[PDB]
Symmetry: D2
Subunit: 115 residues, 4 copies
């Protein structure tokens, strides 16, 4: 798994479960093409997003459906979603983990890029 997403809930102190995660890759015509998607498991991760063959260099967007998550918990959210946009560059062997920490009026994201 060269691309992993981990979503945590800062209100309940737990992984954010049943969250929709959509991944897009910037096409040559500058539009966002669907790339991969899933729903977070009990661990807060959508399993098997992509492969080493499909995940080439490019600009990617990871859209997390935070609005549906907070609505399902009966909590009033601020954001429509959380979108993380980054260039993936292969320098040496690399795996990307995009971690997101959610609060109703805030989110934090970080990337963990390992050899």
């Amino acid at each position: 798994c060269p691309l992993m997403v981990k979503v945590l809930d800062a209100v309940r102190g737990s992984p954010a479960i049943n969250v929709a995660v959509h991944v897009f890759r910037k096409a040559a015509d500058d539009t966002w093409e669907p790339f991969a998607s899933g729903k977070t498991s009990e661990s807060g991760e959508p399993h098997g997003l992509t492969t080493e063959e499909e995940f080439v260099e490019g600009i990617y967007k990871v859209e997390i459906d935070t609005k549906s998550y907070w609505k399902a918990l009966g909590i009033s959210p601020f954001h429509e979603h959380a979108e993380v946009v980054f260039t993936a560059n292969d320098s040496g062997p690399r795996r990307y983990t995009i971690a997101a920490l959610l609060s109703p009026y805030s989110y934090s994201t970080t990337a963990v890029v390992t050899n």
Copy 2:
């Protein structure tokens, strides 16, 4: 000022100065229309983004050009930008402060909403 943006640098421990901030509003055809833009001052804020008359109900996107900021400091950044997407004024006019905290491989954002 019904819409304020405050940008901080978590590496240098200071306001993030000379950062481009672009605001868009979702059109009826689902596209992102330009709404307002500016550059952060010494306080990390772009002054005078919009007015109470222009800032109507709708879906807004605040895009912070974090990539050009880190490149100007000679630091290799991960993200293309930091984008915050939210519905504004659905229950009547509100004042919105969007705060962003930047690191080369991470960012946090929060909203402070007042009547």
Copy 3:
């Protein structure tokens, strides 16, 4: 005001009001001596914590009473408090803003240091 504290609530999207803030300074015997304390106003800040004369070089601790804040809102919190520990004025007098963002199971803090 050489030492400022700003506290925000990531659940409600507002300043965290009526929060107790306690400041200590490390004594020569390595114990924590009381230095200053206050209560956050409607803006999420305790006004007038210290002066340029009193705020000398040293190691300071800013303890934010997040537990009483969440209990007063009927929300079960994880942390006993949020504590920020730092050396101040080692290279000469500076102005320090300690910003804290609160969630029931998480907090973020950042420092903005200016000459």
Copy 4:
């Protein structure tokens, strides 16, 4: 492992390696007693901090040596350390993960408490 600590670096986009982690438990006399310690591995975690038998209810403090970490990377840090203080209550079967995200002038922490 009922108590886990995970430390990430927001500047390098990686786990924070070789970071000292010290855990204390509040004694009946209100002092902080040493409980467990270790140094983070390649994954940003100190392995085998405690056991289900030793990790009883109480008030715990997790101190992360962020200052030595940033100094070892040649980066000027703000904080002396990052301290996370919380009550551990057993309601049902529970595991605690304390996650910390580090920047030179900022840190974020969250707790993940699972059944």
